[PDB]
């Protein structure tokens, strides 16, 4: 049987959903400036 508890578990599963690298000083400066 459907239940409110089941409905809300399905909502929880429905909602629960890149590693860039710094190669040099220029990219480090860009990253630090943004942060």
């Amino acid at each position: 049987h459907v239940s409110a508890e089941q409905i809300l578990r399905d909502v929880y599963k429905k909602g629960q959903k890149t590693n860039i690298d710094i190669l040099d000083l220029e990219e480090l400066r860009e990253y630090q400036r943004r942060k």
Binding site: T18, N19, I20, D21
Partner: protein, 323 residues
């Protein structure tokens, strides 16, 4: 002024398995190799380009020598593409020029002086006279070299909002796919400035590379999220929910992907000098061969007839063969 040298026509042609190791290498391009393609249908020749501004054809068999060298660009090579008949190939360069080269005599059949970087070039599979150039200024230009009017520019596609990343025709040449820095993928009918399909999503990253699966039923796109997605080639062209290939690194690099001659496997380069390979049915990662040089391997291609020979290259310059 263009130049060319011969060192030997060579265009006449003289179940897959996983590759396991690098069997041999070619000198490639000293400052880095930026383009690499096998000769269509038979794969007995390898066309490549790089940072030395040169283009080279290498024999895939016999002594593995370089047969012809083409020197007509003043800046690094950006893209290379063979025609349906192999009789010609297109080359694009950061010098804002696209040139059509006669594969055998190395003579330039056509020159296009563009006002923007030709990020990618492609030729119509059913008509070698038609070619499309994707520009950094976001427009896509369609040329028909037979037409002298306006240097043959027969159509302009302009719905993309940012630099074009990749171009890929449907195997029948009726439609072509385009990707852009605008984070969208679009399908176009030949010579009509109207995209018949648009592929975009919140989580979808820009796709720097596009290729078509040998069965002609799906196309694959390398994405900046270190994944490879797949899309149907039939109307509505929906994304395939399960055929997703993961494992490699590609963010920040235009890393090409290729399919085995029989379509049983899919493979791609890696930003950490490796060559990944996945099963086309389950998308499971079956191998990741380490390529010498310790540089990003951006170029990967699978031989159209061999059971397992693959070629790869990148910033290291040399070209490597895996089997």
């Amino acid at each position: 002024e263009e130049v060319s040298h011969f060192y030997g026509g060579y265009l006449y042609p003289p179940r897959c398995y996983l590759p396991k190791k690098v069997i041999r290498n070619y000198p490639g391009h000293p400052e880095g190799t930026t383009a690499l393609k096998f000769l269509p249908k038979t794969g007995h020749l390898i066309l490549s380009g790089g940072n030395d501004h040169t283009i080279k054809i290498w024999d895939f068999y016999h002594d593995y020598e370089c047969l012809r060298d083409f020197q007509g660009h003043n800046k690094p090579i950006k893209a290379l593409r063979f025609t349906e008949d192999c009789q010609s190939f297109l080359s694009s360069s950061f010098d804002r020029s696209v040139k059509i080269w006669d594969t055998e005599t190395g003579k330039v059949k056509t020159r296009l002086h563009l006002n923007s970087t030709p990020a990618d070039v492609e030729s119509r599979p059913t008509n070698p006279h038609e070619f499309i150039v994707g520009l950094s200024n976001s427009k896509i230009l369609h040329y028909d070299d037979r037409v002298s009017e306006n240097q043959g520019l027969v159509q302009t596609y302009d719905h993309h909002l940012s630099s074009i990343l990749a171009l890929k025709y449907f195997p029948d040449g009726s439609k072509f796919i385009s990707s852009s820095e605008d984070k969208t993928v679009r399908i176009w009918e030949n010579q009509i400035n109207v995209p018949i399909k648009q592929i975009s999503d919140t989580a979808q990253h820009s796709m720097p590379f596009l290729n078509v699966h040998p069965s002609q039923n799906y196309f694959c796109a390398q994405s900046m999220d270190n994944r490879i997605y797949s899309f149907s080639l039939k109307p509505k062209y929906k994304r395939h929910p399960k055929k997703i290939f993961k494992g490699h690194s590609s963010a920040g690099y235009g890393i090409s992907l290729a399919f085995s001659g029989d379509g049983r496997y899919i493979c791609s380069g890696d930003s950490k000098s490796r060559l990944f390979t996945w099963d086309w049915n389950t998308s499971r990662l079956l191998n990741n061969i380490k390529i010498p040089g310790n540089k990003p391997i951006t170029q990967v291609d699978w031989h159209p007839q061999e059971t397992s020979k693959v070629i790869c290259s990148g910033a290291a310059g040399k070209i490597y063969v895996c089997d």
